[PDB]
Amino acid sequence: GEFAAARESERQLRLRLCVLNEILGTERDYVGTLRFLQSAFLHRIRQNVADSVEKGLTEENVKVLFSNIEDILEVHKDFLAALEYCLHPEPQSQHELGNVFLKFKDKFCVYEEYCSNHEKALRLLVELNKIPTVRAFLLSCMLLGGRKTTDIPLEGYLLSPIQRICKYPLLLKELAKRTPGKHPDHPAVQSALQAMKTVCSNINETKRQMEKLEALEQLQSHIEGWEGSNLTDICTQLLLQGTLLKISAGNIQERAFFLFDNLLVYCKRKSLYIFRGRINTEVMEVENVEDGTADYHSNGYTVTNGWKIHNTAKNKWFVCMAKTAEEKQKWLDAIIREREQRES
Amino acid sequence: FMQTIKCVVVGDGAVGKTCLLISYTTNKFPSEYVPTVFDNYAVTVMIGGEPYTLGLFDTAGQEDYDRLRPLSYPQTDVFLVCFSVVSPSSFENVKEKWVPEITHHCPKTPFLLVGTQIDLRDDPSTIEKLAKNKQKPITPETAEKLARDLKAVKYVECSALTQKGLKNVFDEAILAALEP
Hints:
The complex is a heterodimer of chains A (about 350) and B (about 180). Chain A is built from twelve helices and eight strands. Chain A has an eight-stranded mixed sheet with strand order 1-5-4-3-2-8-7-6. Chain A has two domains: about 1-230, Dbl homology (DH) domain (Dbl Homology Domain, Chain A, Up-down Bundle); about 230-344, Roll (PH-domain like), CATH 2.30.29. In chain A, helix 1 packs antiparallel against helix 4 and helix 1 packs across helix 8. Chain A has helices at about 1-45, 50-55, 60-65, 70-85, 100-105, 110-130, 130-145, 155-165, 170-180, 185-220, 230-235, 325-344; strands spanning about 225, 240-250, 250-260, 265-270, 275-280, 285-290, 305-310, 315-320. Chain B has one domain (about 1-180): P-loop containing nucleotide triphosphate hydrolases (Rossmann fold), CATH 3.40.50.300. The two termini of chain B are about 20 Å apart. A six-stranded mixed sheet of chain B has the order 2-3-1-4-5-6, sandwiched between helices. Chain B has five helices and six strands; from the N terminus they run E-H-E-E-E-H-E-H-H-E-H. The interface of A and B includes residues 11, 15, 18, 123 and 211 of A. Chain B: One of its GO terms (cellular component) is centrosome. Chain B: Its main location: membrane.
């Protein structure tokens, strides 16, 4: 009768203990991994920089490869210690973790620098591996660290943080699941879950915007004869690009157009492109031209999928045309969205 | 001098890819608890009498983070694209999300179509739940159709609970990785 209820009741506690224990243990393992990364590799190359440099490891390479992993480690030593303190001596049913997650939320932002850099790190790594003595060195560090060749290489160990930080919310959802409603930890657990999800969101979006910025940088690096301030100063992302026919001052030129938030650029496609012109969207009026129209702007040419662009700052006009209606709709809608967002 | 193979397991959340990896790697779990964390794990396998190192990587938790996921994809030797046979949504997500992504990031790298939780095909409760939506489980035929369409190497089924076909999934993965 009440014995069934008791059985179930304890059966739940078993699972909760399983959750807490998994959290603690996986944390210990993670910290252990980072510690191995520090002691086996960093300490070794620091012991003798002559060998590392001679055999093909400049400090630039180390710096790019390992990023800010030691800071992450310094965070997780303290965090693990906090966990050990809260779960003293071992996970018990009435133990409440959520607050230790909440206390350390703003500490985790350190990951943002790592992930964003990681994409470069591995891409650097693949290069360094092609060098004989460098690869041999990096294997030597693994061997002198006691661990094996068949065992997981440096790459995975470098990958580990991005895996680790994304797993805390799952742990916390299972924990919130095994936590009773009137349990003192329950709300702290829910809150901790939300916080830890927000962390991952921030990391992700940080990486994204970083990559967009780098896209702008690349695009500028592939354009010769650029005029005015850089895109990185006044733009955040590329919205749309494509080929249009440009009728200006009597000239008929096919050009590559790039729409950035805040401005539009047109270039001559050969660097891959030659800068032809730029227009701040804040002083740009785009006016739709009905298909079939022929005026002095178009030099008398009959228009299909065309429109006129007005640079008010220089009081200049010119005609843009597409080959498909979809392209026209694309550019129009994109400019509309850009202008819509720039105000707010 | 024993070449290592990188196998990356991707797919919808809660299809049981983690449970799959854990069930393959170890037993002696008390089996009432479902561990959520699978750390990267090397496994020595025998193929044609020759030993290889199968590196196992999990992607669980990264589902909502599209920008973070491709950080795991470089240097991959073979992919496992998973979906639950009792979850039409995951099945559709293989077509709408995962295969296009892994093919975008690694065009020349082979991938297998993995159907999971087959043991739930004969669960009357699950059948009822799906019947409320006028749905039904994924038939091996349909999934093989999908596999052939998306140019997957082949379609493999398994149950982490029953361990039916579980090992052979990874065996086939290694085989696909060892294709010239």
